[PDB]
């Protein structure tokens, strides 16, 4: 049964609610992005209207085989009427195709559903500037002040410089980047660009990348692994055992691996500056954990919410424990007292 924080009152709409069977009264199912916790339940046998971005729609059709007749892509930054209700999709600054959804309810209430997002000051100059929001359904993944991490630009600068240094010292080193979902493509694309290489990968991952509308993509990726010195592997293989095994497969073309694990936040963020980050090393294999986040830091979230000044906040993440719910409620009241709304 569908939880309350996935329902939009005064409509027939749900958000990210595909794992509950046929939801009573739902005439349109919105999907914010193509991550498995959010699409859980969709398949080629789904027969209700799905509303989403173009990129999410490419992934539904090619990866999940949802039939074309049930896919309803909407352009971004454009007022659209769905089943008699005005909606707008906004870039969420999460993974490719990820959106926030603004709903203009028939009774005059305005609701913003962030989906998953990385708040940014650029959102203060979207179509959000123009009017008031009564209810905010908020991605509260990192809603506590201990969650700090650098800008995505600083993280990419560290990765490019690290990879370029290593491969210039040793032209026989291979770079490996972990992946388990869409998102964070800049990590492997920026490293391959500095090295003058295409990114090599499995046929399954090439297919997924071909759905993302990235400009000039045919110039940047390949399924010919042996022509490429940046390879992608599943995240589960980014360990000394799995990397040793991978090094065998390249027929003695390489004699060193340098590997990246983009994580979200880890507790080594609470002590170490990005500049000071060091790898784990065993022999000719080194592994870097890099804090590349596609969710808001505490401070980014706080800034967004203090600017938007919503009347009510409904968290969408960390809602399962009383301690989490209490902590999040305390910070919302601080933010409101400090800013005066
Ligand atoms: Ni996500």
Swiss-Prot record:
Protein location: Nucleus
Induction section of the entry: During mitosis. The mRNA encoding this protein contains an internal ribosome entry site (IRES) in its 5'-UTR. This 5'-UTR generally suppresses translation while specifically promoting expression during mitosis, when cap-dependent translation may be impaired.
Tissue specificity field: Expressed in brain, heart, kidney, liver, pancreas, placenta and skeletal muscle.
Superkingdom classification of source: Eukaryota
Consequence the record notes for mutating residue 139 to N: Impaired nuclear focus formation, reduced interaction with PIAS and increased sensitivity to cisplatin
Subunit structure: Binds constitutively to TP53BP1. Binds CDC27, which is itself a component of the anaphase promoting complex (APC). Binds PIAS1.
Family recorded in the similarity comment: Belongs to the DNA repair metallo-beta-lactamase (DRMBL) family.
Protein function: May be required for DNA interstrand cross-link repair. Also required for checkpoint mediated cell cycle arrest in early prophase in response to mitotic spindle poisons. Possesses beta-lactamase activity, catalyzing the hydrolysis of penicillin G and nitrocefin. Exhibits no activity towards other beta-lactam antibiotic classes including cephalosporins (cefotaxime) and carbapenems (imipenem).
Name of protein: DNA cross-link repair 1A protein
Gene (name only): DCLRE1A
């Amino acid at each position: 049964t569908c939880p309350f924080y996935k329902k939009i009152p005064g409509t027939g709409f749900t958000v990210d609610a595909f794992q509950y069977g046929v939801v009573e009264g739902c005439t349109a199912y919105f999907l914010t992005h193509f991550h498995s916790d959010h699409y859980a339940g969709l398949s080629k046998h789904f027969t209700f209207p799905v509303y989403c971005s173009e990129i999410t729609g490419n992934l539904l059709k090619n990866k999940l085989h949802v039939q074309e007749q049930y896919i309803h892509p909407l352009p971004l930054d454009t007022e659209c009427i769905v089943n008699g209700v005005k909606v707008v999709l906004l870039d969420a600054n999460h993974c490719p195709g990820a959106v926030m959804i603004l709903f203009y309810l028939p009774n005059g209430t305005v609701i913003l559903h962030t989906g998953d997002f990385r708040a940014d000051p650029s959102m203060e100059r979207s179509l959000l500037a123009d009017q008031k929001v009564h209810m905010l359904y908020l991605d509260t993944t990192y809603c506590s002040p201990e969650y700090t991490f650098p800008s995505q630009q600083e993280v990419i600068r560290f990765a490019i410089n690290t990879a370029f240094e290593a491969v210039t010292l040793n032209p026989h080193a291979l770079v490996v980047c972990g992946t388990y979902s869409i998102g964070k493509e800049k990590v492997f694309l920026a490293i391959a660009d500095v090295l003058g290489s295409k990114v090599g990968m499995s046929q399954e991952k090439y297919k997924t990348l071909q759905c993302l509308n990235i400009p000039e993509i045919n110039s940047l990726i390949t399924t010919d692994m042996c022509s490429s010195l940046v390879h992608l592997l599943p995240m589960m293989q980014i360990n000394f055992k799995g990397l040793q095994s991978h090094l065998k497969k390249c027929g003695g073309k390489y004699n060193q691996i340098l590997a990246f694990r983009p994580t979200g936040w880890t507790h080594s963020n609470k002590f170490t500056r990005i500049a000071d980050v060091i790898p784990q090393t065993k022999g000719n294999i080194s592994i870097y954990g890099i804090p590349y986040s596609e969710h808001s830091s505490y401070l980014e979230m706080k800034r967004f919410v203090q600017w938007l000044k919503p009347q009510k906040i409904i968290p969408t993440v960390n809602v399962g424990t009383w301690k989490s719910r209490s902590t999040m409620e305390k910070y919302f009241r601080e933010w409101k007292l400090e800013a005066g709304y």
